[PDB]
Symmetry: C6
Subunit: 80 residues, 6 copies
């Protein structure tokens, strides 16, 4: 399954990105990843069409709240 990734500065922007990802398309929230320095990543799972649509509006919603530092869709992940 494809993997969608949005990393934000701060936890609240990330929760919003994750909520907007799961509202926008048929993706499943995998969880969050925190590496300190305020960087938090929301991770979603689905078909590449859904994941591309989820990440797209996850990024738009998060930018209203705060800092989106990077985002990515990986259509065919090798690990995880």
């Amino acid at each position: 399954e494809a993997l969608g990734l949005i990393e934000t500065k701060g936890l609240v922007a990330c929760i919003e990105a994750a909520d907007a990802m799961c509202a926008a398309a048929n993706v499943e929230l995998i969880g969050y990843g925190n590496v300190g320095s305020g960087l938090v990543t929301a991770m979603v799972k689905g078909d590449v069409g859904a994941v591309n649509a989820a990440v797209d509006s996850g990024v738009e919603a998060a930018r209203r709240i705060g800092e989106v530092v990077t985002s990515r869709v990986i259509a065919r992940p090798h690990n995880d």
Copy 2:
């Protein structure tokens, strides 16, 4: 099926104040705190959307007296 209120502050003391002012302002229940490092700490509350909007509103006002409020949000119908 409960709304979610979120206040993120720079520092723990502003966050405790935000959480205390949220719980004093309306019929919301504190879920806990979330810390992602960099000094960013998030208070999270639960309730009906009217109560949550009133708590976050005065939670933000109280915290700003103490310190830095970096972001806030009410999510009326959270997906995850």
Copy 3:
């Protein structure tokens, strides 16, 4: 059912000094420390509101000699 005193400092050593000076100043009980990274460390005390106000007052005075007092607060009637 007890008031709460809070001092957040830049660095661990100032915080230990604030906490020692709080507990020497009045009949307050150290609850523990809270660390949210970024060097921010919070000393937390418990007592009647008169004692807690006297503890925090001289806790802040002591810590400022050593280092940075970034925020402080007395919550006379904490909700959590």
Copy 4:
């Protein structure tokens, strides 16, 4: 008894991409990630030195599109780990 490739990025998303791009580029095996705070995250791969050199090369190219590649390295014959 195997070479080690290392890519350190600013942020978690660049690192996952580097790790995905390393494992797609050559016959390397992801060992895991290492996080030391300050946003610095390191993907670590294992393989023969030819494969590991090719994985890191394109891992760095992939990550740089996404974000900050702060350092990278191939250790052909590691003494520890």
Copy 5:
């Protein structure tokens, strides 16, 4: 027992401070305290004369290596 505290930017300066404290006088290393942001604290225990001599040359030693951000001797700690 008195408590001596040296906080440095970085782990190597702190290990150096702790080694120089314990070499200078009859103090006993309690451990380290790390609160992130690179701040690390060496803590020693002993009679107040020893702890004052330990902290003094721990501070001198650490400064050769790196950044000493604060230091303190607490002659009669109320907690810990």
Copy 6:
């Protein structure tokens, strides 16, 4: 009764390089790493003071190629640890 060698770097990859070059340079044994956040991570080695001085010396040279060496130290007769 053994000396301690210490190299602290900004970032995990420089530190692994320092640690590998310490163990390649002399008869020292890697104790482990120490991370205090802010990107600062420390390689720690054990051995006779001559070996430890030789290891730390070239551990620092190797790491400086990759990244930032923020501090280093040899403690010939450590009181604790």
